[PDB]
Amino acid sequence: ANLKQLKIRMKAIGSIKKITKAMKMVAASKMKAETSRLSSASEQASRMNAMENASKNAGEILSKLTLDYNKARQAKITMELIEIISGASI
Amino acid sequence: ANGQVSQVIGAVVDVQFEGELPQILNALEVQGTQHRLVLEVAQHLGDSRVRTIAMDSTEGLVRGQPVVDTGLPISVPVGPGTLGRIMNVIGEPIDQRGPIKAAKLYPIHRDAPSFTDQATSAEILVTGIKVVDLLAPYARGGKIGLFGGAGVGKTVLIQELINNVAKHHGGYSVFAGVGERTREGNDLYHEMMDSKVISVKEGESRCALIFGQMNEPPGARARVGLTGLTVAEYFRDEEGKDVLLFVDNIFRFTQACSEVSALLGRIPSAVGYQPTLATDLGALQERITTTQKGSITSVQAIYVPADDLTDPAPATTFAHLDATTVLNRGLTELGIYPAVDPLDSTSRMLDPITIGEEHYTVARGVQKLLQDYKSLQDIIAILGVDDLSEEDKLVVARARKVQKFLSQPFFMSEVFSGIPGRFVNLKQNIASFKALLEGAGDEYPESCFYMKGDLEESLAAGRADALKS
Amino acid sequence: AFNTGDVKKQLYCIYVAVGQKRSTIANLVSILKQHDCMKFTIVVCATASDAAPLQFLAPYSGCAIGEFFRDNGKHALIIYDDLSKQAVAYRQMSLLLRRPPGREAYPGD
Amino acid sequence: KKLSTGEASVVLAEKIKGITQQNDITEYGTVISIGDGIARVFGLTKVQAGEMVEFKSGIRGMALNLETDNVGVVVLGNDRDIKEGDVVKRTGAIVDVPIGEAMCGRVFDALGNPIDGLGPLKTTQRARVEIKAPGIIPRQSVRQPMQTGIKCVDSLVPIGRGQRELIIGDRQTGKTAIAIDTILNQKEAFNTGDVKKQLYCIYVAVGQKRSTIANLVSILKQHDCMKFTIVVCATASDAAPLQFLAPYSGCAIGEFFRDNGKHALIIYDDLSKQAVAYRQMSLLLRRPPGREAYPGDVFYLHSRLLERAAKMNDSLGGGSLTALPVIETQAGDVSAYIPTNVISITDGQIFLETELFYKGIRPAINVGLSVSRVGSAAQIKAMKKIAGNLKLTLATYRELAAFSQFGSDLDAKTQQQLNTGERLVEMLKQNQYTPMKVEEQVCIIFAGVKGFLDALVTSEVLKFEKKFLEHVRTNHSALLKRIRDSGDLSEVDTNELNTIIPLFIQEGGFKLK
Amino acid sequence: TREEEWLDKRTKSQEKVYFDQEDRKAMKRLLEKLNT
């Protein structure tokens, strides 16, 4: 399915997953500080949990898209090879 | 010499014969070559012509050159004379140690064992490694897939298997290098004769070596695997003992078959492989099994191209694998140097029916305990230790002890590490892990369950530690 | 049903196996013999070592054995261990026949 | 059927006439068809596979397809010269190329003809282009380093003599640059006279324009690194068979040194292009095409070549032939056909990224993917120790780089690791045509792993490198001499180094923080 | 299914807003400075 587009979409999700993972790290640090200081901490806790869930969901989608990219890659090799063989037969 | 070379196309060679023609798969020998050049018959084109694949470089051939029909497929010398000797695909010695002493010469191609002589009720092959015999048992006479990077634990693990199978069992081993880097071959051959796995003195060297170098043309890298397989079949049938067949990554065997098919002009399959992928692979994998006389257990390396498990080659291969042994780099960093991962490694023979209920329960419990610890590690990296309950801390301690326990010293590496190896047996292994899950060792220190053979050894060390203070 | 004799319910069982390991089929028969369920079972084995045409043909041979019971008033249950193996064997024969391959290199038929 | 190319009307007419005159069919041939640089020749029996043949005009050809009724030949030149009906005589000898010492310092064609114009080539003998690689016994373990001069390579991706290391990367990432940098470092031994270290270099150009080759030769003559290097050129204008033979010709020239106990290094540039030339010859011969239209034995083509680079044992002389094949990946995907083959053949690969090249990381070496099988066994005793710690630190830093943009928000002891990794990467950078001796590498890598660089500002790392080397080279010359002779970093030298480095950082004008 | 376009649009929009405000400030400050 136009492996070029799939790879672009795969690259985007990886950046999203990476940025979301980093924010979870930052949220843990900031949540620690507030609990030490102790609603603000609640905001940070929800953010940390939400980023974990988002990075998890992004990872699942990235794995699923990787399967499709490998599937598309095999088909492309097969299709090009068939063209070459059909031309060589005659 | 009633044959002639009609045409030459790279490695492929067509031979014009007179009178009777060589049966397919027979081995033909060219005359007048500087080195022995063998041709494997592939098909009968008609008009008294055959098309064959050369085992060596066809450079310097001439049309009309005489060819001799050996009358049978490639026959390799089998027996204890091959032990400690490097053999070629056509059975020639490449170790410069003189001619091989052979009891008989067996054909590379033969039909797999019948349905009657097949062995039922598959049983474990006790290798001696705690983790393998516990979590990923090796089915006797079954294909095993080894996923391991360059130099993680591979070579030392292979040598340990050979030595342990030689001591506990009466069997030999066979290492077939399918398209291996020649440099690595010298390192392996020299790595042996240093660990004493093979020696020049007769009566020793319980391991044969078949090598098909990358610089060899297709047809050699494709049939070299069958050559090693044949060497092992002799020991199985005649000697009646258990054999261990190591195969350099089977992907290269599959790749070489694909190349000969293309050369022969066969239309390629889905992703460029030959149409006979399943059959070409199934032939070798089926001649490897357990019989009434003995068994051939194969440990073969798996290379996944592009990290695509759904690729035809690894997929058709996994169809045969009974167990998988995954070597992990992280385990090496931690200081544990059996690299095998407990969770990633799997065995199809692991079920409460083939093995006892207690063994299955212990393995599942160990896997669950290790898996829970993995989840908690991701947690503590963010939160910390105090955040954990007391049960979680107990689980961490228990899991670290088990993980450290999974390691054990090997005889082959004792000179290097200075600690002698341990051939842990199956029964004591299961008993030790069951007791550990009960908590018999929670009081002792973690550093005690490291490179220890059996639980008793670790317990004795722990009591000694208590005495020190 | 075979024990009690309730013919109306009893149905014979056919187990075709394409591209299956020989050892797997042997162990399967042993289990079937252990439970004394082999007296009414049939096994048509075309292992991986067997040539592709045999794999391609086994399912049809098994189905014919079943049509016997079907046409004679009896009930038969036929199992086809993976048909994907049969398709691979048929694809092999076709490609070797120089026929044009489709998507995933499978013949049109 | 359809027809047979051997059933030409002229040949058939002779049979119908009944006159059995073949004008010495053996050792003589008549051209039947010519197209795309491939000539089919009827007759010419008794011609060996891979043999040279002479056409009526004078151009040579290679008999690659020995068919029943004809011979498919690839012409080694322009196809316009010879036409149908021409006579072909077999030379009687397989293709061979001259070898010797008198070749070093000369540019050659694929067949050994000097194109530089400096004069006639005077050599003793010639060697066959195609022969079998050494066995398993003649070989010996790779225990000797091949100092490229590149800090990153010599430290993290060591190359031992007799090793096959693959320089793989996308276009314009600095692959040819690494090859030339290696050649320059090897010049100190020839100038000094350390026969043990002398490494003759061989550069094979495949599918490259003659302009860049002239520039390449000028650089070598400028740096004087010529007179011990050999350039084999199969340019884009040269026929495909020449681009296919050049690597084998170069490998034979290197085997001369290897057999005689000398050490030689051979670089194949645009090795992937050689496969393209072979594919052309194969497709025009109507051989069955495989994936990406490459023949089935493309892999073989490369194996039999690369496997000829080996470290011969002390009995044969101890010589060695180190290879450095180059590969150009289109989209940075090594899952292609030719990359996978050459990766499976070679020991390790140096993977070059273009994004890193943009970010200012030159050489743009991705140490994550780059790996060497030989490993520490090649490095000198001094490097192995510090190099291990260096690899670990870079691995942790690449893992942490995902949080680089979040620096102040993250806690301490992690941002510190990030800062340390930056100093190291800046230290690993290097200019073009500036190879470093191994002793100087040890001092710099030592300053980096110990952590002294964390004081300086990243922008000043390179200034410290050059400036500190000048001071050590000037004052502490015995220290470097020991590292060079002994080959190991003794404890005393370690303490001496550990004391002067921070002292230099203070007295140095460069700021710190 | 296009996440890359979403990021690109997000990036462009936020940059434009922030730097449009900066352009306002820069014109005012230089004008104040040019008048004297």
Ligand SMILES: Nc1ncnc2c1ncn2[C@@H]1O[C@H](COP(=O)(O)OP(=O)(O)OP(=O)(O)O)[C@@H](O)[C@H]1O
């Ligand atoms: N260490 C370096 N530092 C700075 N610039 C460099 C460095 N190495 C290479 N460059 C530049 O990067 C470009 C590539 O040089 P080079 O030809 O050696 O690589 P290449 O990949 O082989 O190119 P090509 O694809 O044309 O063969 C050149 O512009 C070079 O000047």
Ligand SMILES: [Mg+2]
């Ligand atoms: Mg270049």
